[PDB]
Amino acid sequence: MKSLLRQIPQISKVVEIFAKAYPEIYVVKAAREVAEKYRKEIIEGARADLNGFLEDVERKIKSLMKPNIKRVINATGVVINTNLGRAPLSKDVINFISEIANGYSNLEYNLEEGKRGSRIAHIEKYLNELTGAESSFVVNNNAGAVFLVLNTLAEGKEVIISRGELVEIGGSFRIPDIMKKSGAILREVGTTNKTKVSDYEGAINQNTALLMKVHKSNFYMEGFVEEVKLEDLVKLGHKYGIPTYYDAGSGLLINLKEFGISVDEPNFRDCISLGIDLVSGSGDKLLGGPQAGIIVGKKNLIEKIKKNPIARALRIDKLTLSGLEMTLKLYFEKRYEDIPVIRMLTQDEKALRQKAKRLEKLLKDIPGLKISVIKDKAKPGGGSLPELELPTYCVAIRHDRLSSQELSRRLRLAEPPIVCRIREDQLLFDMRTVFHEDLKTIKKTLQELLSI
Amino acid sequence: MKSLLRQIPQISKVVEIFAKAYPEIYVVKAAREVAEKYRKEIIEGARADLNGFLEDVERKIKSLMKPNIKRVINATGVVINTNLGRAPLSKDVINFISEIANGYSNLEYNLEEGKRGSRIAHIEKYLNELTGAESSFVVNNNAGAVFLVLNTLAEGKEVIISRGELVEIGGSFRIPDIMKKSGAILREVGTTNKTKVSDYEGAINQNTALLMKVHKSNFYMEGFVEEVKLEDLVKLGHKYGIPTYYDAGSGLLINLKEFGISVDEPNFRDCISLGIDLVSGSGDKLLGGPQAGIIVGKKNLIEKIKKNPIARALRIDKLTLSGLEMTLKLYFEKRYEDIPVIRMLTQDEKALRQKAKRLEKLLKDIPGLKISVIKDKAKPGGGSLPELELPTYCVAIRHDRLSSQELSRRLRLAEPPIVCRIREDQLLFDMRTVFHEDLKTIKKTLQELLSI
Amino acid sequence: SGAILREVGTTNKTKVSDYEGAINQNTALLMKVHKSNFYMEGFVEEVKLEDLVKLGHKYGIPTYYDAGSGLLINLKEFGISVDEPNFRDCI
Structure with missing residues (x-):
């Protein structure tokens, strides 16, 4: 043979x-x-x-x-x-990206003072205006956005979260498995289908450094189901002096009912003006932009997260950054139909x-x-x-x-x-x-x- | 008033x-x-x-x-x-990226089996061929590439590294500050200017899980200065059964002398064919592509790194992934002059x-x-x-x-x-x-x- | 020597914050050595001497400089322009 x-x-x-x-x-x-x-x-x-x-x-x-x-x-x-690659891009955007990548740009360079500058500085101006938060920041993706806020504010200390919000979105993402690697101690309250406010307030103590809620983005529960209102968590936090962190995930930038679609999906501006201290979400979802972890909230917190030595390993690339700015520019000009994901649903x-x-x-x-x-x-x-x-x-x-x-x-x-x-x-x-x-x-x- | x-x-x-x-x-x-x-x-x-x-x-x-x-x-x-934004991109690449972003794509979709698939799978084929490594992987940037290898293989265990290689590249990156956040225990050997092999072999023990060397990319030392050859570190590893991890940083994909420029800058293919177990580097440096942390080495290690729940917070976006594949395609076709960074220096x-x-x-x-x-x-x-x-x-x-x-x-x-x-x-x-x-x-x- | 070593900063760069950050109950000395037989170029930062003195006098900690070169006088006075440190000036 x-x-x-x-x-x-x-x-x-x-x-x-x-x-x-x-x-x-x-x-x-x-x-x-x-x-x-x-x-x-x-x-x-x-x-x-x-x-x-x-x-x-x-x-x-x-x-x-x-x-x-x-x-x-x-x-x-x-x-x-x-x-299939989530939110596709409008040509407007893809061209602004094409140009910035074609050659050198003022990425980390402030043209004013002629010395290096933070690349996260170009965008944040847009964020704080659109959401209403004190300060903002952006990283690789929301996955990392979570991980960063946890390792930044709760390493070694407890974080309260509803047992119905320990999700598994994607193939490798799981709040319980990441938060572990985050260094934060997980304190799960309530039960799968139901969770009252008493559940949250009951597990607070000397170690509790965070009150976290995750939005069930890729699943839902019907039948006998109870959830803790957002206004109530904010109230609970300001009572004990504990910060509130909402992982929207959807990263819906605006009120959705304004376009004829009637849903309760939460959004940055509204959740921020509600009293939440921090909020995050993916850019390649309901925002319609390139992959990006977005965080907005209190200045004092943003500063804490930025200074974390891990933020450098999550800091966004030149492509999504620019591409993010032009998507943000479209949102200020109310050019809604120009962003694919928005037009397709509306x-x-x-x-x-x-x-x-x-x-x-x-x-x-x-x-x-x-x-x-x-x-x-x-x-x-x-x-x-x-x-x-x-x-x-x-x-x-x-x-x-x-x-x-x-x-x-x-x-x-x-x-x-x-x-x-x-x-x-x-x-x-x-x-x-x-x-x-x-x-x-x-x-x-x-x-x-x-x-x- | x-x-x-x-x-x-x-x-x-x-x-x-x-x-x-x-x-x-x-x-x-x-x-x-x-x-x-x-x-x-x-x-x-x-x-x-x-x-x-x-x-x-x-x-x-x-x-x-x-x-x-x-x-x-x-x-x-x-x-x-x-x-100014490191390595600018060739129009050939800018167009391939432009196309994949204009609409939906098979990012996480394998067209063969019609079920979801790993987006990191498209490229890896290229890497293992060019480097010669057993398996590969890529994340946001090299900063995170390091971070991930450390938390993956040395959380809670010791990692030996030369005292002259504890660098501060960029404004926020510092091998000592991140490795700490990495969960790995840092064992610095030798002295600033000089470090013999004895220094490495001397600090090994029960907890030593990693032998790591960083390439002084944004600085250099002259005068009385000694360094430990790479062949020696591999020998040292294989004697005690300890893995070797090289952070090239420059991310030079090929031998540089072949283009007329005589420098000792290290490259993947050669470093891997040397006996190194793992090697990383930025894509937007000597590679000439978009920002990306690149890792290549032994299969059993790559699999260990991928499974890490943190890899999902570093996984690359749709833009840099595509743009990375077209920059890699250029290298296989020996289209060197087409990547800006390479053409400008040669x-x-x-x-x-x-x-x-x-x-x-x-x-x-x-x-x-x-x-x-x-x-x-x-x-x-x-x-x-x-x-x-x-x-x-x-x-x-x-x-x-x-x-x-x-x-x-x-x-x-x-x-x-x-x-x-x-x-x-x-x-x-x-x-x-x-x-x-x-x-x-x-x-x-x-x-x-x-x-x- | 019997002394406990607290190394701050990084190889190429070291700001003042690094020094002030590692001080504590046991910190009995602030020591700086002059890179005499080698040098680093590229991205490299060092802590000015005036800063270390200021830092010492704030916490009440002594400052010890190992010049090594043992240059007794200012070198520029002889036509050779170098930043090499000397006793009179350092003191």
Whole structure:
């Protein structure tokens, strides 16, 4: 059998077979990858033929020459899709970022005095105005925002939190596991479904340095359920002289009812003007900006957090920083519709159907396509609004030759790739998340798969 | 005195004064800011006039309509300028980032299996190939990269490090201050200027969980100075069964001598092929990419670091991740000249003068300009190569009317702003860091400051 | 020597805060050594001598300078411009 492997050609040989076919570098890489897959499949004795080799090597090349990370047409109708890269960016923003990165900038440089300056200084001016807090700060992500406030104000001392708010958001984030590593001592009060104020006030003592509440962003509880009002926690804190820290998570920058969507989702300005001492949240969620941990609250506290030697390991990069400023600039100018996440959720019901049938008009001709437009109620928010359920128009399709399952599979392999919902062997396309310029790309993808 | 303030107009009044002059939003903001500066200056009794008010309010508006962060033309000749935003990005990269941010992407989504996937998985393939390490990982920045390795492998246990390598890079970073917060116990061996191998081997014991060495990136010592060779530390580790962790900091991905520049700066591939168990470094230094903490080494260690609940608070954002992959793609394709930092330092001496005099040809006409081109020896590397001194052509200038000091100041106030060196009342412009499309922007700035 | 060593600051940089921060009940001496046979360039900060004296007189702690070079007089008076410390001036 040491003859069923001697066969396999030489990398020198295959690079020849692709003279100008493909770059020499990409050829050798695909040959190696392929050369190893045949040595093992032959060593375990699972291959008797090698003809697949030639065809495969070229497939690796065609594959290995395209970027891993690629824009993806989201048809699921979930605005904050943790998996697809959360909040996408308006071009306005992406260009301001493009420019600052193109060359040098006054990142850590104050042009006034001609000496180094804090990079966190450019933005904070925007934050304190929009929220109303005394001072602000920003780090890598909210995950770290939590960890920093804990290690800053409660290392070695106790922090009270409701047993119903010890969440697991994401694959590796868990309030209980992080806070541990945070150095803070965890004192869990109340019970899963219910927690009164007595529960909080009961566990206070000499060690209690913090009263923390987390917002159940990626889940919710119904049935017999009780929660401790925010006004009450503030009252409790100012009674014993204990600080209050709210991890909003959603990072909703403004009141949401002002846009027609009626929900209780909390927001910075409102929670700050409520009496909370500190508040944090992700920027790539309900804020609609790049990944960023945002913290706002009392000056005395912000100063304490900034000075922590760990803040330097969380300090934001040049990209998200600038990109954050232009997203913040848009918020001051009330340019709401310019921020993707905002526009997608506040879209006119009329507006949705309008795009639902403009796509159906582009697929009537494609062979074997059963096209219909259905009005369905989905839950837009993926990583920030769990309970929200809003109506949206899906253009459900079905081909006679291929099945809905196999259909989603090839669409995710397309270039560009398309990810969509599946419900009872009927592929669905939520228009809540689909951009206009994709409609033309949707039709050309479908016609290249069912006609090839 | 309560009448020297009643005077000041009403925000309703000023908004009027700027009907279509400027957006009402920006007008009120500047009026408020201005209204406050006059109430305090009159309360402390430092202002008797209010005429400056109208002129100023309009200046805030002109200013406030302009974002705080702004691109700046670096003429200092320092490629890794910690202050000006370190390594700038090639347009090839800026566009790939631009694309992935415009919409949704497969960030945390594996298109193959159609279920969530690790976003760190896209890149790692590149790293292990370039470095030769068993596994890799990346976080916010190198500051955190250190922090994470320490809390992951030496929380509560001792880490040996040379007393000459306990650096303070940046304004808030200090190996001793962070390692403390890291939970690791610090065991400093040797002396400032000298440290033999005996010093390392002498402090080992039951608690010694790590042998760590830091590269003196932003400083250097000459005179009687001794250091412990890297081969020795690896030998020492493998004798007692202790891991070795190198914080290169510079993040040099490849051998530097291959490009004509003779320096001993360490690099991943070589450091790893040396026997080092772990190695870290910033992406925005000698790598030339976006800010990122990079770690490569043994698989069993990488897995230990990843599982750390803190890794989630350091995990990189969508912007730097993508931008990092395209910068890594460039390295595989041997596209060295495409990454700014690399091109600027390896430019032909010939190359530099060629741009030195093409600028002097643009300023001969401007009034009062004393233009001369000198060949000076400066130090290109700011945050990664302290000792390097390379020759470069500066176009030293001098006007009869204004002084060099006043000169630098107006230049930083220009749009775009230009930052340059000062030496003996003579302004200088190192061409090592100047982009060609700036030369035209330089001339248009100068003629607009001297003739207006 | 029998003395307990309290090292402050970092290799390349050391501000005054570092000195004043480690003082306590046992702190009997504030000592500074002159880097005679080596030097550091790049990002490097040092605590001025006037500051250390001020710091000592505030807490009532003695100041001890190991010049090492043993330069008895100002060096600039001979044409050579260097910052090397000397007894008369340091005292």
